[PDB]
Design an enzyme around this catalytic site. Sequence first.
Site, mmCIF file in Angstrom:
data_model
loop_
_atom_site.group_PDB
_atom_site.id
_atom_site.type_symbol
_atom_site.label_atom_id
_atom_site.label_comp_id
_atom_site.label_asym_id
_atom_site.label_seq_id
_atom_site.Cartn_x
_atom_site.Cartn_y
_atom_site.Cartn_z
ATOM 1 N N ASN A 261 -1.645 -1.035 12.421
ATOM 2 C CA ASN A 261 -2.215 -1.848 13.654
ATOM 3 C C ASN A 261 -3.875 -2.084 12.891
ATOM 4 O O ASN A 261 -4.103 -1.502 11.911
ATOM 5 C CB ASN A 261 -2.050 -1.127 14.898
ATOM 6 C CG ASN A 261 -2.600 0.000 15.298
ATOM 7 O OD1 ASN A 261 -3.642 0.241 14.711
ATOM 8 N ND2 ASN A 261 -1.831 0.867 15.722
ATOM 9 N N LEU B 141 -1.816 10.655 13.399
ATOM 10 C CA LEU B 141 -1.710 9.396 13.707
ATOM 11 C C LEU B 141 -1.048 9.248 15.244
ATOM 12 O O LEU B 141 -1.044 8.257 15.593
ATOM 13 C CB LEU B 141 -0.865 8.732 12.810
ATOM 14 C CG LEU B 141 -1.455 8.708 11.382
ATOM 15 C CD1 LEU B 141 -0.412 7.968 10.318
ATOM 16 C CD2 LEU B 141 -2.636 7.821 11.450
ATOM 17 N N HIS C 95 -0.638 5.131 16.560
ATOM 18 C CA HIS C 95 0.217 4.241 16.044
ATOM 19 C C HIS C 95 1.763 4.442 16.691
ATOM 20 O O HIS C 95 2.239 5.701 16.719
ATOM 21 C CB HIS C 95 0.405 4.239 14.500
ATOM 22 C CG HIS C 95 -0.926 4.288 13.669
ATOM 23 N ND1 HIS C 95 -1.086 3.040 13.381
ATOM 24 C CD2 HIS C 95 -1.770 5.095 13.813
ATOM 25 C CE1 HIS C 95 -2.470 3.219 12.816
ATOM 26 N NE2 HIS C 95 -2.861 4.365 12.847
ATOM 27 N N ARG D 115 0.810 -1.238 0.157
ATOM 28 C CA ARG D 115 -0.195 0.151 0.016
ATOM 29 C C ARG D 115 0.862 1.065 0.049
ATOM 30 O O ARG D 115 1.688 1.484 0.842
ATOM 31 C CB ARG D 115 -0.868 0.029 1.262
ATOM 32 C CG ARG D 115 -1.889 1.038 0.988
ATOM 33 C CD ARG D 115 -3.294 0.994 1.885
ATOM 34 N NE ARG D 115 -3.981 1.930 2.221
ATOM 35 C CZ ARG D 115 -4.514 2.720 3.301
ATOM 36 N NH1 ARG D 115 -3.930 2.304 4.363
ATOM 37 N NH2 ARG D 115 -5.387 3.616 2.952
ATOM 38 N N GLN E 295 3.490 1.728 3.237
ATOM 39 C CA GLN E 295 2.973 0.477 4.022
ATOM 40 C C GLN E 295 3.569 -0.838 3.429
ATOM 41 O O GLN E 295 3.466 -1.177 2.464
ATOM 42 C CB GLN E 295 1.858 0.387 4.512
ATOM 43 C CG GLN E 295 1.392 -0.552 5.467
ATOM 44 C CD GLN E 295 0.093 -0.403 6.259
ATOM 45 O OE1 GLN E 295 -0.711 0.572 5.995
ATOM 46 N NE2 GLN E 295 -0.501 -1.516 6.549
ATOM 47 N N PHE F 205 4.705 1.462 8.387
ATOM 48 C CA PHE F 205 4.882 2.564 7.390
ATOM 49 C C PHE F 205 5.769 3.304 7.527
ATOM 50 O O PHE F 205 6.129 3.581 8.794
ATOM 51 C CB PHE F 205 3.527 3.190 6.950
ATOM 52 C CG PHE F 205 2.897 3.585 8.653
ATOM 53 C CD1 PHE F 205 2.159 3.127 9.612
ATOM 54 C CD2 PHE F 205 2.972 5.111 8.600
ATOM 55 C CE1 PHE F 205 1.788 3.760 10.696
ATOM 56 C CE2 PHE F 205 2.659 5.735 9.935
ATOM 57 C CZ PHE F 205 1.951 5.113 10.652
ATOM 58 N N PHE G 20 1.740 10.645 1.421
ATOM 59 C CA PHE G 20 1.251 10.034 2.861
ATOM 60 C C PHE G 20 2.202 9.181 3.383
ATOM 61 O O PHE G 20 3.033 9.403 4.278
ATOM 62 C CB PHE G 20 -0.099 9.619 2.747
ATOM 63 C CG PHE G 20 -0.522 9.165 3.863
ATOM 64 C CD1 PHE G 20 -0.258 9.343 5.212
ATOM 65 C CD2 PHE G 20 -1.704 8.040 3.999
ATOM 66 C CE1 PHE G 20 -0.791 8.819 6.312
ATOM 67 C CE2 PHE G 20 -2.405 7.857 5.133
ATOM 68 C CZ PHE G 20 -1.946 8.088 6.327
#
EC number: 5.2.1.8
Length: 164
Positions: free
Chosen positions: A101, A121, A125, A54, A62, A112, A59
């Site tokens: 997660n 985040l 995370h 991903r 991942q 990521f 951004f």
Amino acid sequence: VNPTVFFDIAVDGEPLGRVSFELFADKVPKTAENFRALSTGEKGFGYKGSCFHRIIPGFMCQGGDFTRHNGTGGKSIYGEKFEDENFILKHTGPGILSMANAGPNTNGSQFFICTAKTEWLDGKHVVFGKVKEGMNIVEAMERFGSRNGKTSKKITIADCGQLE
């Protein structure tokens, strides 16, 4: 004393380059140790050969799902998803390495690499490392992602391990 690990990245099987990370074992030892051990493969499983499944430009990239290769898998070195160690470190810009997660206290092996500041985040995370060298390689990887996260070429960890 903080460990350094590297990923050698490939794109459709062609070498792209090396990204190295500082892991913050001083501040998040259990989370750093998981990633370091997965990176060496010393438990008999880990990141070598896995993909970044991903990637959303601007951004994050991942990866870490070495079991199902699509974001539904992965496992920690501890035998069962682990707790959020702490949220001392924040998502303060590009290069930040953080745990993916499935809600509170569900850390496995997925992670990521941020390519921007992602403060929303924080507290959700666990940040446990930062790219030390090869941010340019992460930038080159990012270009093969898309709005919905699907990659247009296969992004792989061709080799990985610990540096010193």
